[PDB]
Amino acid sequence: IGIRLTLPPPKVVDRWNEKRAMFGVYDNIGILGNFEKHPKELIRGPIWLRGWKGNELQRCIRKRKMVGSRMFADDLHNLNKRIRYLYKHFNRHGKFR
Amino acid sequence: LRNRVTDRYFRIQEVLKHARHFRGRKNRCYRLAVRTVIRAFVKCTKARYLKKKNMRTLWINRITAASQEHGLKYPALIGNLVKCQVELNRKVLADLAIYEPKTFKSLAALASRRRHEGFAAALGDGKEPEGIFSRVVQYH
Amino acid sequence: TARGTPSRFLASVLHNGLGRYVQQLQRLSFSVSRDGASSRGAREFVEREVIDFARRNPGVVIYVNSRPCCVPRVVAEYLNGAVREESIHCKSVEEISTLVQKL
Amino acid sequence: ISRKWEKKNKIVYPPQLPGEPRRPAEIYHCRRQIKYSKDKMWYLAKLIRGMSIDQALAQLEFNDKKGAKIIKEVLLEAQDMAVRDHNVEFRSNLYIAESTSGRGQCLKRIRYHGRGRFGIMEKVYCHYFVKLVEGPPPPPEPPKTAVAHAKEYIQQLRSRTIVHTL
Amino acid sequence: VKKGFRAAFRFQKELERQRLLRCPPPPVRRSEKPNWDYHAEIQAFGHRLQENFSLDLLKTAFVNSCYIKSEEAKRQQLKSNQELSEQGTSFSQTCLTQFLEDEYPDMPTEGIKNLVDFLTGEEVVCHVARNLAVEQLTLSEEFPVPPAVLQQTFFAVIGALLQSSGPERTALFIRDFLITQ
Amino acid sequence: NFKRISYAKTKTRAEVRGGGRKPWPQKGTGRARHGSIRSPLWRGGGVAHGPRGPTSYYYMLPMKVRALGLKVALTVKLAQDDLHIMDSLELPTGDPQYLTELAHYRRWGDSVLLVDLTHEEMPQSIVEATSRLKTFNLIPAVGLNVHSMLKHQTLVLTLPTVAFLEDKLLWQDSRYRPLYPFSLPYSDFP
Amino acid sequence: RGHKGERQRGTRPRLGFEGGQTPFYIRIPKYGFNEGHSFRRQYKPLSLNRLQYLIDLGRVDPSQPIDLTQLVNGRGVTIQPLKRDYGVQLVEEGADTFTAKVNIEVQLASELAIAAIEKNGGVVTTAFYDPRSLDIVCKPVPFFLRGQ
Amino acid sequence: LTYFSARKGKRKTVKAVIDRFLRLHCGLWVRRKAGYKKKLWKKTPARKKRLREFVFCNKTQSKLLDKMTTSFWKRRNWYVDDPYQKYHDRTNLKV
RNA sequence: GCUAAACCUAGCCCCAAACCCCCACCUUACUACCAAACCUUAGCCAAACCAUUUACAUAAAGUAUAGGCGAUAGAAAUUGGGCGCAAUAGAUAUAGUACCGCAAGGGAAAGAUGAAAAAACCAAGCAUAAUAUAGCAAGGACUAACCCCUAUACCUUCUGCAUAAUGAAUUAACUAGAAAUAACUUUGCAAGGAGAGCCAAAGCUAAGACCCCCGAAACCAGACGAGCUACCUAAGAACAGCUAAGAGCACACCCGUCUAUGUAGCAAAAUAGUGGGAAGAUUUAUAGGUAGAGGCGACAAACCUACCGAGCCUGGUGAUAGCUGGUUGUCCAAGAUAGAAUCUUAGUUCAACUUUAAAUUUGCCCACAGAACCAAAUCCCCUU
RNA sequence: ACUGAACUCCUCACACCCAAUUGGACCAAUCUAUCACCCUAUAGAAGAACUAAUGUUAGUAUAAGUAACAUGAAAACAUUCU
RNA sequence: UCUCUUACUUUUAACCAGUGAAAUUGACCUGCCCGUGAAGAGGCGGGCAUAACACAGCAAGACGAGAAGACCCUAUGGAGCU
Ligand SMILES: [Mg+2]
Ligand SMILES: [Mg+2]
Ligand SMILES: [Mg+2]
Ligand SMILES: [Mg+2]
Ligand SMILES: [Mg+2]
Ligand SMILES: [Mg+2]
Ligand SMILES: [Mg+2]
Ligand SMILES: [Mg+2]
Ligand SMILES: [Mg+2]
Ligand SMILES: [Mg+2]
Ligand SMILES: [Mg+2]
Ligand SMILES: [Mg+2]
Ligand SMILES: [Mg+2]
Numbered sequence A: 001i002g003i004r005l006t007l008p009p010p011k012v013v014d015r016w017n018e019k020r021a022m023f024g025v026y027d028n029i030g031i032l033g034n035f036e037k038h039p040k041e042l043i044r045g046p047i048w049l050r051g052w053k054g055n056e057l058q059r060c061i062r063k064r065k066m067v068g069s070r071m072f073a074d075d076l077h078n079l080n081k082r083i084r085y086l087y088k089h090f091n092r093h094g095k096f097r
Numbered sequence B: 001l002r003n004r005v006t007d008r009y010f011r012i013q014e015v016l017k018h019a020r021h022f023r024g025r026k027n028r029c030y031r032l033a034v035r036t037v038i039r040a041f042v043k044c045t046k047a048r049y050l051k052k053k054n055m056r057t058l059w060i061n062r063i064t065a066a067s068q069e070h071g072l073k074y075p076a077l078i079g080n081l082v083k084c085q086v087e088l089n090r091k092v093l094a095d096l097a098i099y100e101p102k103t104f105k106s107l108a109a110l111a112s113r114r115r116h117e118g119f120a121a122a123l124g125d126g127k128e129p130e131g132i133f134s135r136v137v138q139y140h
Numbered sequence C: 001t002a003r004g005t006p007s008r009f010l011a012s013v014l015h016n017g018l019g020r021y022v023q024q025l026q027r028l029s030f031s032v033s034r035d036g037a038s039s040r041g042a043r044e045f046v047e048r049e050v051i052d053f054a055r056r057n058p059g060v061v062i063y064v065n066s067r068p069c070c071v072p073r074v075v076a077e078y079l080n081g082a083v084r085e086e087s088i089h090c091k092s093v094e095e096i097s098t099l100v101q102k103l
Numbered sequence D: 001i002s003r004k005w006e007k008k009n010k011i012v013y014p015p016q017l018p019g020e021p022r023r024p025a026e027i028y029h030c031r032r033q034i035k036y037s038k039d040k041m042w043y044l045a046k047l048i049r050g051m052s053i054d055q056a057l058a059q060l061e062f063n064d065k066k067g068a069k070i071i072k073e074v075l076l077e078a079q080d081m082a083v084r085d086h087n088v089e090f091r092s093n094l095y096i097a098e099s100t101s102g103r104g105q106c107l108k109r110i111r112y113h114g115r116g117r118f119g120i121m122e123k124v125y126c127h128y129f130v131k132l133v134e135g136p137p138p139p140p141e142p143p144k145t146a147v148a149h150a151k152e153y154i155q156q157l158r159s160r161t162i163v164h165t166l
Numbered sequence E: 001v002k003k004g005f006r007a008a009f010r011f012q013k014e015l016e017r018q019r020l021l022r023c024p025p026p027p028v029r030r031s032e033k034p035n036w037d038y039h040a041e042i043q044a045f046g047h048r049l050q051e052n053f054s055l056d057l058l059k060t061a062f063v064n065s066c067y068i069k070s071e072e073a074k075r076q077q078l079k080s081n082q083e084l085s086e087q088g089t090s091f092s093q094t095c096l097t098q099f100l101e102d103e104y105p106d107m108p109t110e111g112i113k114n115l116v117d118f119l120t121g122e123e124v125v126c127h128v129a130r131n132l133a134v135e136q137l138t139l140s141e142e143f144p145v146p147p148a149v150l151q152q153t154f155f156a157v158i159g160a161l162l163q164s165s166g167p168e169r170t171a172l173f174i175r176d177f178l179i180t181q
Numbered sequence F: 001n002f003k004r005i006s007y008a009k010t011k012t013r014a015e016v017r018g019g020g021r022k023p024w025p026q027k028g029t030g031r032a033r034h035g036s037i038r039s040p041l042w043r044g045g046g047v048a049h050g051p052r053g054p055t056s057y058y059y060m061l062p063m064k065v066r067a068l069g070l071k072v073a074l075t076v077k078l079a080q081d082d083l084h085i086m087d088s089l090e091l092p093t094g095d096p097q098y099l100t101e102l103a104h105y106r107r108w109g110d111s112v113l114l115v116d117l118t119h120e121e122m123p124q125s126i127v128e129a130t131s132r133l134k135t136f137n138l139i140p141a142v143g144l145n146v147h148s149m150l151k152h153q154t155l156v157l158t159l160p161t162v163a164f165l166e167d168k169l170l171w172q173d174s175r176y177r178p179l180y181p182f183s184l185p186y187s188d189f190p
Numbered sequence G: 001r002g003h004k005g006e007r008q009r010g011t012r013p014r015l016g017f018e019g020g021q022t023p024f025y026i027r028i029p030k031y032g033f034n035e036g037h038s039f040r041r042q043y044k045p046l047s048l049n050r051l052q053y054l055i056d057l058g059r060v061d062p063s064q065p066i067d068l069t070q071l072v073n074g075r076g077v078t079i080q081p082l083k084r085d086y087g088v089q090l091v092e093e094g095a096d097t098f099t100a101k102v103n104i105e106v107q108l109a110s111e112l113a114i115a116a117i118e119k120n121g122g123v124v125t126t127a128f129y130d131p132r133s134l135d136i137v138c139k140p141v142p143f144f145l146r147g148q
Numbered sequence H: 001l002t003y004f005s006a007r008k009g010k011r012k013t014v015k016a017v018i019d020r021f022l023r024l025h026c027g028l029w030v031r032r033k034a035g036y037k038k039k040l041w042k043k044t045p046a047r048k049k050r051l052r053e054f055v056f057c058n059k060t061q062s063k064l065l066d067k068m069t070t071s072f073w074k075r076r077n078w079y080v081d082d083p084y085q086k087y088h089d090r091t092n093l094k095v
Numbered sequence I: 001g002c003u004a005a006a007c008c009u010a011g012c013c014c015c016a017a018a019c020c021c022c023c024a025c026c027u028u029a030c031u032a033c034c035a036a037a038c039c040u041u042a043g044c045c046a047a048a049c050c051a052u053u054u055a056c057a058u059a060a061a062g063u064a065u066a067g068g069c070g071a072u073a074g075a076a077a078u079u080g081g082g083c084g085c086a087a088u089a090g091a092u093a094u095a096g097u098a099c100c101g102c103a104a105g106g107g108a109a110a111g112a113u114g115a116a117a118a119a120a121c122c123a124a125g126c127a128u129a130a131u132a133u134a135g136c137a138a139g140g141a142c143u144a145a146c147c148c149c150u151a152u153a154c155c156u157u158c159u160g161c162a163u164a165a166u167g168a169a170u171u172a173a174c175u176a177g178a179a180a181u182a183a184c185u186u187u188g189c190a191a192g193g194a195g196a197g198c199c200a201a202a203g204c205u206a207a208g209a210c211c212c213c214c215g216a217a218a219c220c221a222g223a224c225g226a227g228c229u230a231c232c233u234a235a236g237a238a239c240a241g242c243u244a245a246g247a248g249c250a251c252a253c254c255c256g257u258c259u260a261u262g263u264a265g266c267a268a269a270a271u272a273g274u275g276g277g278a279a280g281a282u283u284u285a286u287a288g289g290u291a292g293a294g295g296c297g298a299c300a301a302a303c304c305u306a307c308c309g310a311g312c313c314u315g316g317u318g319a320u321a322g323c324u325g326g327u328u329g330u331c332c333a334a335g336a337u338a339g340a341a342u343c344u345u346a347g348u349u350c351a352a353c354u355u356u357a358a359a360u361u362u363g364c365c366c367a368c369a370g371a372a373c374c375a376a377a378u379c380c381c382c383u384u
Numbered sequence J: 001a002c003u004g005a006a007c008u009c010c011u012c013a014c015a016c017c018c019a020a021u022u023g024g025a026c027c028a029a030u031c032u033a034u035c036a037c038c039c040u041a042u043a044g045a046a047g048a049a050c051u052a053a054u055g056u057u058a059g060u061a062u063a064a065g066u067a068a069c070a071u072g073a074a075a076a077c078a079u080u081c082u
Numbered sequence K: 001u002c003u004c005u006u007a008c009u010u011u012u013a014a015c016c017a018g019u020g021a022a023a024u025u026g027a028c029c030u031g032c033c034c035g036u037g038a039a040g041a042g043g044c045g046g047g048c049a050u051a052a053c054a055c056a057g058c059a060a061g062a063c064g065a066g067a068a069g070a071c072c073c074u075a076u077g078g079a080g081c082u
């Protein structure tokens, strides 16, 4: 019977956190900071998608090319198998042509 | 599992509250219940055409039962209550026969007088003056 | 369906039309949040038309409770002791004014 | 797991008024995890389900089944409890009101069949619940006589209405 | 554990309906419940019946005799009902015979007195009183209000209406609520 | 959404451990046809259409739309009576108790966004005051943005900051299309 | 996706496959339409209607010589040296109602667009630029940050 | 075609489209007629003159070749002495 | 009221940073001590077969080139902490353990009190409480459960299924639409747009919105297997009694002719009776050897660890499938049948039909007149 | 002559009976932003919904208390007998 | 062996006591006749029959259970051989 019997402990969310009250600051650091920095230089994450958006094939092509020289040995083989699969899916399968 | 269904209990009880009065496992097991709860709902709307059919067949069988008590057939009563412009329907005529049998004896007397006025006009062909209960009321 | 659901005969409460017509509502009870978008129309019903309503029938005694609820309810209690609690959650002002006149 | 039958012997009713008939004692007792099946216990539990406790101990001393030797151990401990703990004066003034058997937590072993195939053998356990109510046993319901069938038929004729009309 | 709150809240309120379908609570009278104002329900009691009372004299028609005794009992830890209820019982007996001796002149005084004892009995009056919110407004000790006290409270309302708007409006209050039974 | 990088990743049926051979033959037993014990069907198997890799949701609005959004959010705080213009963000004392009472006395709101001109030239009194407050935030003028102007009820600008935005946001109107990005030296831009 | 064919399964043949017959884009003989297309020279056209319009709005300053830099700094023509633009050609469209004493250096120039500038007292010369030399003369400031 | 290449992640173009057809910037594709140099001795001079012609393509043939080529082949091409320069713009359509 | 239910933190995933780690043991590993490594990957698959061929910062650019010039492949100059999972999830992991296999190898399951143990209500399934003429198990009803009247389960597949066609005991949980240019919608700015590269004869930038799941027999690469069995090698052993030599009768032994039992069995090939050989080309214990493009073979295309027309395991591998099955909230709307090509007729492309959005002006029905020489009708056609 | 439909009229109300496909209006639950504060609002997002794959795993049924399974005898439980 | 089968013993059997599987299974409140129908009906049509319930046999039916028919044909699916 997949439904819980006691109602869960209450989710207390501080809306005036440090990360919440100062969220969004310096997203316009270009257009009113004399264009020294782009806002794409403000995003922190992986190296291969710091300022770049693609589908799943274009992400694995970019991950193999940018950071794939220093990837682990069976993480590179799991990535090469994924590009070998997503090539065949996007180019040979599907409804529209 | 990022978001899986947390409220599946209440979707089952939307169906299973209609099945509580069934037999077997149709009242408990959801897979067997939806094939009968759907089928119990289609029969609920297809029997709105059969209630109006089975009530009128009941009214005809209760007018035919009571018109035979005065020697009338059913087409000799309905056919000649129309000709006197007495536009009573089958529901009232079957509820006059049960609850007011003196008034129903007067409607069987009237539908048999108009019937005899229909025969006497038909055997006497050529121009004859009309019957007394055969005179129509015109509206303009 | 009709074989699942109970049934009753067409009646009135105390022969409601014979001598006089007695209004059959006793109470309406509105829970209406002061801050809350779900009771946006319920706040406009109390502001505009609950005073025009409470004069159109002076037998109904109306209680606006105004407590912090997520779902605004209307609790219509009748003369034969029956309680019909309904929700006016996210309804416009024209949709509560017919829901209350139906009650 | 649940053990709600053990807790029914702890309900304390308010002390009675003298303008009220005397409440009979109720004694809930059970044994859990009997190495015997829950539907072989039902034939022994159905047998004693209305009887007085002395007739129940008589009809279980001479039953050949395994569970009759176990119910007779349950009914004797619940009769000893009724004079000790739940204040019944007479041992003989009890009768079985409820006598059922649930299933217990069963174990699973492997039964080998004739080839590489096999089956999953389940070692059955069961519960046995009893309630003794203090008093003489109520008499068994007699078959309704020809007078009582004729009243019900005439009451079914008397109740019919003219249907689908005023 | 399926994460979320809205389905765990609904099941908590479907358990509380089943906890009242397995163990229904005892009935509590209307004045010990939320959303109740005793002065506002009496003015609404008058206008509901399309008739007007003297609202102080209607307030004394609802306070019974057993209530004043058990208001002095809890005071260790108001007029009664009997004066207005005696006028209303005595008038509505002579008002109902005047209604029934005018419509049925052929009936004997045995059969008329057996008709007024039906129309003012505990089976008719306490059925009429429960559907005009008289049990909600009455002040008694024990709940549900016993039919010997609720009949006394109902005729005090007719007794209060006699002093408010005379014997013409009061006979129409007996014609619409007692003769319809 | 442009800052968002979601780190949800699930193992598909090729990265899940094991499941190389057919579990049972294709046609012998009365069981169903299966090719590995790591199918999406199997308990423990791969996900058919789960989230894949770190995903980036980066896109850039045209900068005349990101600047118009700053203009739009400034007319709103002016029309809704939420904008207040100071001459300097200087206080007599650096207590939060004085600044919180001042916002309650002037009927500002619970949340104030104080915007000075330059981050390093901010006065010491407002810095030690707002640093302990949750709903009072100091940003420099470069750190102005639409989201934090909407999260806060009142927006408090200074007179150098007002002239800062008029230089910056009215440059976007009446300007050429670029030849190369404005980080490079033009003749009259910086 | 339809009934169970090759559409619902998702394994349709490539775009241009016509069921097995030789396709439309292969039944047609090869012709040199686009044979040497990346070595053809392109010249972004600049009409005299556009050159006059940039003069009357202060974007192109006619009191100085009009190089190809001053056409690009005033953003009157944008040329890309990759994709094989070899400069700006002068175009005879708008030769009447052209009023400018101007000193212009376009890369190609028709016979009538020269005649409509020399009539008003101007000078037309036709210079040449390499693709390396053109990529400097359009956007010179990313060349001066190159250190060469 | 290759909708997503494995090196870059872009569309490739079918290079058999390029050696056969010419796209005008209005949107028309222009082709030579098949068999225009095959067995010319057994053809009448009227039939030989029909084959020596650049003819346009259908609506669906133009939409199929538009998918088969990228956006590089759909740009303005300001060549010096293009003989098909006058055919790129479309004058005087009423749709 | 039993069975059960519920629970939240073990841990994990993705990134960022920072480059990680006493004794005995290569002989039969866990045993104190004696006379030689380097040698192209292939194939599935794509080409709708297949045989050359087929991918393993930004921008130039999917351009030059390559190519059964065809599927497709493709440069360079130059430019410069969490809108993660929370015990069927997340790692296979409580653990590479238990268990399975000779071995390589495969590979699990699961736990929940409280501050201190030195203190209820809800699945299936049953029971409480077996059943009463009659029929998809209900519905219309009814005073009334049934009696009366009406009603040929669902999914899938199809010309068409109550179909005696498919699937399903049932409950809980898990389990299936991933994206391009072009168009459209909505903004920004506008002969310019865009935060370089690119497009532009109203464009351009940004957003939104369309492309599934399970399943072969196979193929190849590299390991692991000759403790069963086929044959061989080494050095062993066994064969009563009776008649007189790959002799006869006959035990032990080995084999399995025929019958019966057994057929989820005692047994994934046996038991009981009967039978063939049993001093030999015999049977057999032990250790070794030959290995899958092969071994071995008194050829049965037998046997090679229970399935050998080519072992088994891991890898390529989420092989491929025009073939079957499956494809999960609600409501409304429009919506059916000319054909042609095709190693193609179980499929696809184009047309036709259908759908949406847009622009415009005619569409359908039709009257005279008219449409060829060697029947019914149609075509054309203003009015209406 | 009467009977007889979902046809047609009547009282009220109307977007509310086709496969594949296509267009449209809504939406459960989850997380995030900000609200809300007995369970919600407007948006952003996505592992976002199962009466069916001889589906996977766990529980429990049915067949079924069925098929099948076991201990030579007496006794002083020393022993003896078959 | 049969004409032509019969008797007895043992195992099984059936009953009592203990232990206790399996394939199977849409739901079943599970009749017969003739007709119909995807062309052989417990279920539809017209009739006929009909209190409810075990236990033992039987094998005519449930196109009985088992094993995604090996026959045949199809696949621009495989493989062995020459
Ligand atoms: Mg079992
Ligand atoms: Mg694998
Ligand atoms: Mg099966
Ligand atoms: Mg398989
Ligand atoms: Mg997993
Ligand atoms: Mg696992
Ligand atoms: Mg061909
Ligand atoms: Mg191929
Ligand atoms: Mg294919
Ligand atoms: Mg380079
Ligand atoms: Mg796990
Ligand atoms: Mg249950
Ligand atoms: Mg029937």
Ligand SMILES: [Mg+2]
Binding pocket: none
């Ligand atoms: Mg049919």
Ligand SMILES: [Mg+2]
Binding pocket: none
């Ligand atoms: Mg079937």
Ligand SMILES: [Mg+2]
Binding pocket: I166
């Ligand atoms: Mg099939």
Ligand SMILES: [Mg+2]
Binding pocket: none
């Ligand atoms: Mg089946």
Ligand SMILES: [Mg+2]
Binding pocket: I226
């Ligand atoms: Mg050997």
Ligand SMILES: [Mg+2]
Binding pocket: I247
């Ligand atoms: Mg011999």
Ligand SMILES: [Mg+2]
Binding pocket: none
């Ligand atoms: Mg011999």
Ligand SMILES: [Mg+2]
Binding pocket: none
């Ligand atoms: Mg041999």
Ligand SMILES: [Mg+2]
Binding pocket: I299
């Ligand atoms: Mg041979």
Ligand SMILES: [Mg+2]
Binding pocket: none
């Ligand atoms: Mg052979």
Ligand SMILES: [Mg+2]
Binding pocket: none
């Ligand atoms: Mg596949």
Ligand SMILES: [Mg+2]
Binding pocket: none
């Ligand atoms: Mg329609």
Ligand SMILES: [Mg+2]
Binding pocket: I322, I346, I347
């Ligand atoms: Mg085919």
Ligand SMILES: [Mg+2]
Binding pocket: none
């Ligand atoms: Mg016409």
Ligand SMILES: [Mg+2]
Binding pocket: none
């Ligand atoms: Mg009709």
Ligand SMILES: [Mg+2]
Binding pocket: J014
């Ligand atoms: Mg309509």
